[PDB]
Amino acid sequence: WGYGKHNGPEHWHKDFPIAKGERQSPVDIDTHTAKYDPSLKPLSVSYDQATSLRILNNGHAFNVEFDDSQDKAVLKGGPLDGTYRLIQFHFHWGSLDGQGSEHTVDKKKYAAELHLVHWNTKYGDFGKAVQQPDGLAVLGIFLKVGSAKPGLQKVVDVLDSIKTKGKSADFTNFDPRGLLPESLDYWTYPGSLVTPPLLECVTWIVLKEPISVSSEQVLKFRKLNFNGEGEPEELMVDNWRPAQPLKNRQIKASF
């Protein structure tokens, strides 16, 4: 599987039948249709104690991994029940500024989208969590081209080091708080992972307010390779999936 012409998203259903399931992601967020839910509690993001370990290129993106052996970086409140632990964060981007995000707002596409992946600690390990309907909680944040995001530069500068698939580099003392927008207003719905196994275990939390990055920042993203070292170079661009049918599901708003 990949994002090419012959292994792209339109082909995933052959290996992952769940691809045409009932609670597939990403989706278009219709802001006129979204339901203002007053019973929705404020998000609780506790990342002061976050411990970043490394960064790796897994051939479909780059993942910043965290120490999830303890309740160090957690997400709670909002639509969630219990505590979710941050395990990694990554992005989906485009070849142009006009595309890249997974989720769309009123059909509008952003330059990229940041996914903060958390797993429900009642299940003991990520592996068990991915087997539950309430297994994961993913924080999605839109990225728009404008002014530079200072907080994101440490990640941009390390990309040289993990240009190809399978490369990883030590990445300690990275503070994820630098990537958050000012407001934590959000939309939420029941969905799935946006890449294979495309397991329908995620509670989606998409922030309303996008963060801005400079053209130079997002450009460095586009210099990445899908391919392994000493293979024909394939730039890592457009690692996003077409929006899926909401199919009855309802998108709730905290605002």
Size of the site for Zn ion (CB under 5 A): 1
Q: How far is the CB of 213 from Zn ion (least distance, A)?
A: 17
- Cβ contacts of residue 55 below 8 Å, gap of 6+? 62, 63, 64, 65, 155, 158, 162, 168, 169, 171
Whole-number minimum distance, CB 115 to Zn ion, in Å? 3
Q: Does 103 bind Zn ion (CB under 5 A)?
A: no
CA-CA distance, 193 to 21, in Å (whole number)? Answer: 12
Nearer Cβ to Zn ion (115/208): 115
Residue closer to Zn ion by CB (options 49, 243) is 243
Give the count of alpha carbons within 13 A of 54, CB side only.
10
* Active site annotation includes 90: no
Q: Select from 23, 109, 115, 118 the one that contacts Zn ion (CB under 5 A).
A: 115
x/- binding map, residues 37-76, to Zn ion, per CB under 5 A? ----------------------------------------
Name the nearest CA neighbour of 222 among 122, 100, 115, 77: 100
- For 202, counting Cβ atoms within 10 Å of its Cβ (0-12 exposed, 13-18 middle, 19+ buried), the class is buried
Catalytic annotation, residues = 60
Chain residues binding Zn ion by CB under 5 A are 115
